[PDB]
């Protein structure tokens, strides 16, 4: 994970009414391994509830973290990189019903991408 961009296709899980419900037209998260930045959005639905937005997260080695917002609440993102895959968790201290674990697989890899941005690959 030394350079390039990977755009992942991701799904979150929340608990609603004593069951696990998934999120989501696709949810992307993009990791830029040049600039060590990450961004994306988990799209919800009526059961999973509000979308999760991730602007300007950070990458260090095979780990990433940052802030997220969902339903007006701010969350703390932590996750890992492992077709390759990604997973993580987002905690919302102001409303813990928004807490979610997510995972995903690579949608598009550009390992020789030399851009600095976290715009999704298509």
Author numbering: 194 to 217, 235 to 292, 302 to 341
The authors write:
The NgHpuA-C structure was solved by molecular replacement using KdHpuA residues 168–322 as a search model. The NgHpuA-C structure is almost identical to the C-terminal β-barrel of KdHpuA (root mean squared deviation of 1.28 Å for 120 Cα atoms) with the only variation being the loop between β23 and β24 where NgHpuA-C includes an extra 310 helix. The two homologues, KdHpuA and NgHpuA, share 30% sequence identity and 48% similarity. NgHpuA has a three-residue insertion in loop-4 and a six-residue deletion at the site of loop-5. The Tyr-201 loop is oriented towards Hb but does not make direct contact; notably, this loop-4 is three residues longer in the N. gonorrhoeae homologue and contains three hydrophobic residues (Tyr-226, Tyr-227 and Leu-230), two of which are conserved in N. meningitidis. For example, NgHpuA has a shorter loop-5 than that of KdHpuA, but potentially forms extra interactions from a longer loop-4 containing two tyrosine side chains and one leucine. Indeed, deleting loop-4 of NgHpuA does affect Hb-binding affinity.
